[model samples]
Target: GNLAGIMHRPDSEMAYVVNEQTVNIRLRTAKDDIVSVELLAGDPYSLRSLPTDEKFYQVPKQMTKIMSDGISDFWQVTVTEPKRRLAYAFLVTDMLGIQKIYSDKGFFKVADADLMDMNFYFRMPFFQTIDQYNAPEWVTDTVWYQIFPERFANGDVSNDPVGTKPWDSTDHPGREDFYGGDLQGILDHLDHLQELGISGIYLNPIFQAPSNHKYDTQDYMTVDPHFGDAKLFKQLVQAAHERGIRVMLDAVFNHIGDKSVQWQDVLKNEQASPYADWFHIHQFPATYTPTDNFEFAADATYDTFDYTPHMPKLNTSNPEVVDYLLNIATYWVKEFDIDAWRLDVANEIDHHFWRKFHDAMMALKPDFYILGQIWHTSQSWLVGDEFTAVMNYSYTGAILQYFLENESADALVQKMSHQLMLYRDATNRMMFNTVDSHDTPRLMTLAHEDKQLAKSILTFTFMQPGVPSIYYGTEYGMTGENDPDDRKPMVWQPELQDHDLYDFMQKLVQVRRQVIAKLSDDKIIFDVIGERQIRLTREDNQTRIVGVFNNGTTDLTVAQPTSILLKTNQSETQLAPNDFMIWTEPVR
Candidate 1:
């Protein structure tokens, strides 16, 4: 009767193969009811040629139960198809011993398949390598630290912007104010990142631009003088790599600053300028006043990012513009050997251009990661052709709803589960999951400075499906509200930091890399246990790991914990209020 929970979609992340030629298919059933499930799969043409009753020739193969998030059990199987095409159906048997064949067409009658062609089975026409999303192999094991460049540090004040203030001198930061943070500062603090077990660093816009926040691009090819020159950037990449930290540079391709040469030429030469066609200029002799105020800029003659006339949007549909942007994308990687790119305002860019961008960049380095800055559900861009991952704000929103907005545990699980189901596991694994960033309020601020609640939120992020990212100063217990406020200077004083919180974060990263990343099987199951708690279960051939979270105001006992490995508040059998715990159980 709970057949409604069963699901399989033929295309994309639901049912597809990877570069390994292993076809992976998934099915979900209502929690604990199904005794077993098997996949009936083979070439459609081969099965269709058989005699009436003999068509069901192949034995059904049992699938491995990967994860169960208390409400549903998700099963998956990997099989290598010799013919590169597939026609499959699920043989589902419930707790009552009732059995049925479920396919794309519907539930099947034994006699009906002989009367019909292979149309009755779910089909994958052909497995093409180009169609397979080739996400970077190293993504799942990474834990990221995002740095707002202007406020991180000032190792060398010689390159500092004029009138730049000392680090941590101000509690409130503004859009145009500079704090003298440079690449050398990051170089000097490599020990901080390594000690915290950070495997990756996502630096905010470092390219040459006028404002403190470098989204306004003055030159795509040059590093901002305030941050450092090319030599220092290359040095920073080498140093970070030496410390086992991968570097991801931010690229703002959607628009250019009005002060940029291209825009300046168009402004000076009017319609006759060679670069006039590069931007969407609605009027000749283009002239407009600019402002730091985001709300006041409202001239609609030309397109800009968020209606700011100064940051003119480029015509990505133009071949010249596309080629120019593509050159910039490859230039940084070729020159610096950086591992990944974080595309700024990526959703606003066209798909056609992104496809070209992906292909061109991959040609340079096949394992290169392209992460998009999309704030919503990103299935369209996550198809593997456009991006390896996205900025996973959807996951952050769900975390905030439960921890800050006082939502129930069941609602959090459902919201998080819905996000997980939106993409293939490949895309989800590479997603940039974060609770706070330069654009939003700090996690501590959102949690009302409740350190326990903040630690709980961090626990959920690190244990979830995607690659977790920590915004700068999170370990130091820095708290701020949105935008310029969230972009405060990084706190470096160990005495000022919450040492207990810092140690907790360090343990989280160590466990994720040392234990979870070692799993041969990447399947993770989600389970919502009580009104105030949810759990994640993962297993390997030898071991099973369960992560439990208690968001309520009372202590909760672990139902099947065998041993405690890592936790926020350590205990073998119980989780305190707002506590997160991880334990091991034998693989049953």
Candidate 2:
């Protein structure tokens, strides 16, 4: 039997409450095996005492096949829950006329339905308003541009750090290297961003820090002098707002640089320092050499972010520490009207602190966004009262594997479906989807400088659900290896930029705005056409768009007329190897 493909987990992503009265449940089974699946649900208390034969009592609800990847089919059903507590099970029938009852405990004989214990059914304790995930409405319409300030551009050489090198001086930059990029530099390029149709900007840490990357934050309340002062930052924000661009700043509250005032005081006064409680310091009179070449030793006296001794991890659970970080969170929005915050190492911080952070931020600005930097599945923090979205590295990896590594279409669809299923409709659309960032190698380098292959991957990325983000200079065909190499200065000279790639990117932004942006529905349908192709369909009340991709090495034709909305090639109904296209039609 293909029953091994059957899947359901209680109180997890597979099943959850969507709203005050709507509860969603999902089931999975091998393709071509299951002819039908039914959801049997009722109030847990009501089901225990009511007669099983009563009309409309503990009845089975029909399930809809939401998506499939040729190997398996996923089914979903939503039921109204007035009592707020429910118990559920599934009755699945195979093609051979055989049937089985499935529940949280395991499979059961059909004849045992009336005698089955209520404990065997999955249970949802209750649904509360605080548990509903709600992200900012504006995030759904945003196309993000990520900038690493030190490498983006240098508008003010007067405030440049000592030994700052000229922009684009080298393809390979070191940790100690600084290229003098600043806030004014980003302000100057506002026109370029506007031209590209970018609606949002996400910047790396710009707080007071000694490192060029600014990940080693020295002060939460002050902007780094090398980047610019408070006055210039406000001007940049005002200018970006005037151009219809939202700004999101990065927050590194997980740790602070050893050179920070609080850390310096802790090192000097030991236990007597008032700020000693802010960090996870284990020893009095902490002694260690803080340098760029530092590493965590067994004899270390304090906790740091990922064994980097120079960056001390903050104890966010502490009341004083919580207040300090929360103050920074609120200060930026109230003081500068910043649109959002991209939290650094967000998974490491305590959930209690985040709940408090969420409440405070929502109170200040109901539409404000809180983006977490988590590389893996974020179900725990995504349960409504925490983060609004996460930096979607999972999406990035899937794209790289499919295009660069030539992963099978079945594998790609399965991965994408699993990711989309993890979040509710609300949070998934607001996710910060990216191809590459300062922490990883450039997407061009990963694609081996194949412009056609790169465009094919990007075309598919922009059409997927979420707010798409472009790493700085990626549209200009910049290539670099990992780490410091990826952080090299942005290509500013017009002659050095790749005009074709830039034009392609600009067209992508337009298509995204015209078709995909018109629909806010996150429950997109996926159909794996074959091993080399996949098609996605999404619709709103008025418009419907179908996105098709040919990831293989041959021309492929579609049966439809192919009223192409956007394509890598302007030719015909047939898409060449390593190409993609989108089509739109009016919905009745």
Candidate 3:
């Protein structure tokens, strides 16, 4: 039998825990290879001593063909009442008349009564309440605005760094320059965000550091003086909370800044330093010299994060280092009632250390959010024990390519199908989907400053699966290259801001905040018509939300929706090129 295309893992995304009493089990098979699948599951103890002596006594429930992308079809069913001790297997019927039982044991003939041992099925020994991936409920409905503090504003001139330039003084800011943005500025501008209908703010690292970017950390416990003191930071958090906004601070525990107390101590005392084990110092004395290609020189004596010796990697395996970072993580939540942490360089840290980090944060606040800065296929980090979800860089790139690089509609759907198939439903809901960030060029510049394409992409981004995020100054139509140049001061002057773009973003944010709660996680359907017309429809028990987008060359007509939630370059039931529309209607 050619049963080579079936797959499942008992304790991973394939067999996932949905909550205390439910698990959503998913299996994949070659497209059109299977006619049907029936899941046979129950408590192991319940099946061992059955009243009737029927061989392999079990109950079979039909599995739904939940997802397909022209390549494979994913079958899924939810086990809503596992009763804490569960063992299950699949009874699959292929396109041919052949039938087989797929278990942890190899595929077996369904008619073989001797292969009846209960041990053949996959088992969940004892499911616990904590095993479920329980991200904060608030996260799914949030539209996050990422703010680079130094470039966002300057409310308190009193806290400005000396020799600081004026706001929006230079379009291309230098790597070492600072423009004196503070927590007070954020507090002062809370009304703007509230008016724009955003629910959360993700601030880059604010800890004390030598560099302007603060990626290198001098002190995890201290708020950067240039930004504000701890007291002001507390006030800012409180202010944002009052306005219905959650705040997430950035965490940089994977590496230590060279100027940090621990690193400086090691430099002076070499192997005799008390903090010698705090980092990866391979020799008696740790040192390094610069190179044009960023490779370490002959004198390089220790490990670092990508050869930038100023940011020395920490020994997370060391118990002391683990405890030190854990305290820093818990302290902010305990002291100021902060809601989340965005981990910087999170993939480099040890997995066990992140497990400890998760336990500590959960201990402080059960619903606390953790976001990792991972830029690849990040399934391992999303196992309900470590992170809610990582930054969705792969998803971001795919979205940009479809709209900006002219990727085929079918290819885009396939990429999206694979992403949906890779993670659990809860994990996908909390994914930090972004169109642009401080790490890349602004979306406006990525679209050649074409406001229509930019807004169309933004609409698609928010309407897709996951929590949506927008970088700072995006609403102002700001455009630039990557890094220091992209991190220009936020446009504050009324004459300078793009009101059209701002209004467009404001509408998207409002629509997202309103319609997201109405849609179910699994019912979203995607379809491609003609060359570049894509239709996304999401519905629940009472209503339906549909989004029609055009990346094509001609006009498309739409039946008047019950009501329009959003539209771009669309008029009177007609969607022109690079146009889109989202509408809602009651489900019948």
Candidate 4:
């Protein structure tokens, strides 16, 4: 009647070193079946025993059931040993009061208590400190502000596309509309991000392309004329750097636009063009029929990104294409000294190409970040080589549903636990966590324009184990429900901006840097206090932070926190509807 029992991996995320002296470990058992778990671990050669005791026996460390889903409860324990090498096993007790010793071979009955056999336990030979795929240490507490190039600010009107719409227009943006947002605009708004406590800027595609979104690349070496020249982009990076803000660029390496010289040549010369193999060509002439009003073709003679024929998928398998892309990647790092690259359609590329891309970037800057636009499990790419982290839509989606869509707190906790366990502790901390972006609806709109509820969403995001990203205008209470509309121009007017929201953003950023950055992923605990209330607690060696959230309709009284850190709509006695609070106490 059971599907799985006592799951643990000795050398994986489940059991890995978090520091020079401590190792984070986890174990999973059948849902509601296990009453308690004790981790028995020690030096492989030495038989452990208390100094005053006569007989030799190992001491068991208790494991805490951190979170539970439908089928399993994740129990976690940390072992602190300066030696960093040990053999481990688990003593598990089920609901029926049956005790068993679980080891690498299999489960064993504990009737006679023959647990002294160290050879049967799993061994961690040594913790490899330098070989882990850790995200840049500087990135852990940075609050990133994501800016869409054409809508952030229009500092220079000279580079505006013809028939550009007014910057202050109230109308929703269309696909072809341009408001002339450029690198100079980003430079002009440095104070705004700084005031909001932002330490990183994630700029959308700035490479030369025809579309407003700039996903289809015409030239990797040149910044879009509308955005600015390469020199101006470098100036923007240096300016941001001077302000203590890191800049990350968007790279669309998976596809190229029809307007690109490589794609145009294929049209003119077909198979004879030197760039013919640069793309996937299915027929003599790479052709397709426009579906509606010369918009795009649903059917194509060659492989493209989705059904659009204008954006041709690059043949990353081809050696020439890989070299060309690698040069472009290294050029920006060497010449401009940008901090990171957000690769578009990252999952579609092959491992070999990404390995080359990672090595090339690291050779220039060891702490350089490579963020992938992946929406699902990214284990393959996050294995110390391909990427530092993904966009983390899976974690963001779970958060959005819990607060805005009224999903269960139980579901939220389980999903988050599973997501963190999917990667190493370092990689989990590096994930690019965001609640809204240019691709999704604004968080404010999703909260039905409820300012109080939106605060709860951001609260949870900043508290989690990752770098939090705030989209442009989100702190100003921007509201947009879909694509073009979500890409609105930045709010500049003092009267129009959401002053309260901005202030709240500043506080969250400050607290995350001071408190949340030091917490470990394996130590975070979530408990569903009621049908509508959830509690979050994160503790390390010296600090403890606890958050109580009330997403219910009625008022609920919570324990008075020793030191109040942040609260939305509540006092010490009661947490009102759709309200939340965070507080901290010294670990006693």
Candidate 5:
């Protein structure tokens, strides 16, 4: 017999039994005839209390097995070994007359190992439904601030004069020059973020690292000296938390600095080294072939940069390394009381490691979220069981490239709408929606400083679902094209001219929070409102909220329909270049 099924809610959990023609499975009771058997895919943690009639009553779908042979008949079941537990039960019918023999039924707690070579089996508790899963309250609504630790700010002037040579920034500053953006700097800016209503800050690598970015971690136990000592970090956390702002640090486990204590130890003693298993080194003390882009000689040392010899990739396949990372995640939660973690290059690492790592973190702080910094298709990460959210770059990239930059009007509407839909599930976990980040060019630069185009992107970023992340200094009219340029220092030359954009952001946040129901949990339906404009309507049986946009530079004149566009004095809708209208209406 062959039967296969996987849970739909927690799509990651799957199992099946396969044999000759039919999967041999039977369930029955000696006293009472089997009333009915329901198939399910899950562990003992599944929620089956909901009404049975609903299609998704069981959050995670599970296939049931009915055994033909009933030895004891009380409750007998079998499954593959090393699997999560499952829920098994039966119904009973009671009678009192001639044929009314009272019947009783019970459940069976089956071991997964009992069934060998099956598709999958109950391995652990699984998500049965969305109701059972609630987005951490902080995640549902909050503004996130993402920082490149190096370039943020230097709090202590002592660490300020970092090791810098004349030609330092030239070779990517490998294992050297620290820019001294310490935890105290973050604490200093707490008032600024609070005034702007930012709820959380996500910083890249703060652990002991040789470089400014801290991506090439040197030690897991200590904070980067350049980023201030442990005391400053604790104070920073306390300050932010007092003001209701959360701090999220980056976890970079994919690689380590070549000079790190562990890696150096491995290099010193290959096979006999205590840290030998920490990394994957096919050859002991090996050197890379050669590269033209790096400063180091054609030595075999590995670096995060393919060319640079200062960084080396980690062997995530090692269970010890996995546990070590899990403990690091736990350390931050236990020590700093940080709200969440932003995984750097998450997609590049082993998926199994991420699952275990996330589970470990949840054990310490169940409400803390984990955001994946995956730039591309993260569908595999969003099976709803592992990562809470991912960087919403795919959607932001597509919409900007297709609609604003290239102006491909034909498929643009569908593309924008489609990306929005995909973010719904990801958003529930936690989402990062920012047009300008440290790695990429600023939105203003991407739009070529065409205020109109930037306005369009900014409007959608704030109005759309997900946590609207504002890269530090974006609202102040900061401009940069790409990469190094985008990571430019925060301009202190404050001109009051950009106040409108800043106020616009504040207004949007206030409105969104005031009309929380409209921005939260509501599904929006997008449609073309005009030849040059598109509109997204969030509607229910009682009301409709419409967000109409004119992405084009030319004025858009659209006839007033039943939907009312907000911020209007007249019944008709007219927009200037790159203008937008957000309004609502009563449902028919």
Candidate 6:
């Protein structure tokens, strides 16, 4: 108790008392030669923990799961403890060479024993660039397109009528019926999308499902027989890439179809099933009973949800099950060169699995993105070790509701501004924007099939902070009340696209991408030009574009000579109904 400057407290189970007593001196840094260091108390005031570290604080495997630049603090050892043994290792950060290029410094500091008991602390003169935890290269510059393979197109009609199954047949392209939209159909349309400058494509679930939409995956690895085999899928990836589009697969891992092999194995073998330990089985001898259409033809013992008496929920905590899930994800990256994965019902699955899943997927491709089906504010998912982003139903739904339901262009602008501001991430904005998907009613219906409102929304999407994602048939005014209806085939007929609508979309997308250098992920500057109108500027040093979106259909005057960055059209610039203006600065 008398060697190092640290002392053991009498009341502490095993804590250091900051005093004259000697104990081992521990250092947070890896460098042995530390000059002047300051020992502060509790936590730092100006320093906020990195997002990666904060997210991993709760995880047991913080060191590995955390995605951060590095730590902030270091220490200087004082030889006040002269009578006892000392143990310490400096956090040796290389200074001038590759180490300096990768990390900030190689300085060590004498860490106080009291700091060990605390969860937070501070160090002055930060040793590194704190903003290194960033969005990967592809994400920053990508625009996404969500494709529903069954409804996108039918390239190979031959594969449509495969040997009949219980769920085969076109009843309405609903869960009750099936249409022959196969992987080949999607592959066939890559050129069409690529022509429009699409960078990434997020396909809805293509795995085996009991219904039209394949959220209920029967097998993790195998392509659904109806959708062709693994060979066809590989070809689709090749086609998409050739057209300059990145392909992303949809994964529904929370539950499986009732008729799935793993579930069946669990039911038949019980404890003896190799997969028996996979699902959560009730301890009761008389397991829950199945209802109509879910009756067990076998022993008629256990009950299950309507989604399937067979689609059992896997025990993700089980180590074997974890490996199985991770391995499948790994195989895709190594084999198919997929750009990303969109997870269905991401919230229902175990968060722990995501911790492992993220690591496994990232290990294969550093830029691999994970998009979760969180139709709400998914702040936690982004911060958690699970997702790179969520399917932005909030912004999408809000855009629809504000224009259609509220019928206030002014309100929509304000609402949109607040959304971007609330979901603030200078670089990761693209990960959080989407319009329509297979699971929801298309925006066309939300806009009451109004072409003008649709155009406005399309414009807003491209101008917003996130990467704009369009539903497969939205550009052509696709309309339906519910899912399958909303996801009808993408019409190849040229007449289907309203000339103005098609041209406007083409022009908007072109400008968004073409002027991106100026509208880069710079800070979004917003200033109200009028009570219901706002002038928003997005720019970098070399480029800047000012967009004026009026919340009201009424033409409002944007008092001229506002901010140094933007200029109004006149004392009162006319903002046509649901209209927006995108003009380069120093007005052309």
Residue 555 local lDDT, model 3 = 91
Two-way lDDT contest, 2 vs 5, winner: 2
Each prediction's TM-score against the native? 0.90, 0.92, 0.95, 0.91, 0.72, 0.71
Which model, 2 or 5, shows the larger TM-score? 2
Tens-place lDDT digits, model 1, residues 1-588: 388888777876668777545677888888787888899887787765756555443677898775555577777887677878788888888888888888888875555544246777888778777788776778878999999888888889899888887677246987678889888899999999999999899999998998888888899889998889999998999999998899998989899988899999998999999998899989887866556675347665677888787788999999999999999888888988989999999999999999999999899999999999999889989887889999989887888888876678777776777678678877777888899999999998998989989988887777777888999999878889999899888887777788888988888888788877777755577787886788878787787878888887789987645577676665667788888788776675
Expressed as tens digits, the lDDT of each residue in 413-485 for candidate 4 is 8889888878877788899999999999999889998999899999988888888999999998999978988
Candidate 4 to native Cα RMSD, angstroms: 3.4
Residues 244-357, model 6: lDDT tens digits: 788888877776666788776765667777876777666423244556654243333443333455555667789998898888888877988998988877877778899789
**lDDT winner between candidates 3 and 6:** 3
lDDT of 2 by residue, 479-555 (tens): 99888889888887888889999998998999888768877553477777877788878887777888888878788
- Whole-model lDDT values for every prediction: 0.83, 0.85, 0.85, 0.85, 0.60, 0.58
Q: How many residue pairs clash in model 1? A: 4
RMSD of 3: 2.1
- List candidate 3 stretches off by more than 4 Å: 53-58, 69-71, 113-115, 292-299, 520-522
Candidate number that wins on TM-score, 3 or 6: 3
Local lDDT at 13 for model 5: 16
lDDT of 2 at 111: 80
lDDT of 1 at 276: 89
User: What's the lDDT for residue 571 in model 1?
Assistant: 65
Model 3 C-alpha lDDT per residue in residues 310-371, reported as the tens digit of each score: 88889999999998999899889999898999999899998999999999998888888999
Candidate 5 per-residue lDDT, tens place, 315-361, comes to 78887887787788888899889888888778888888887886787
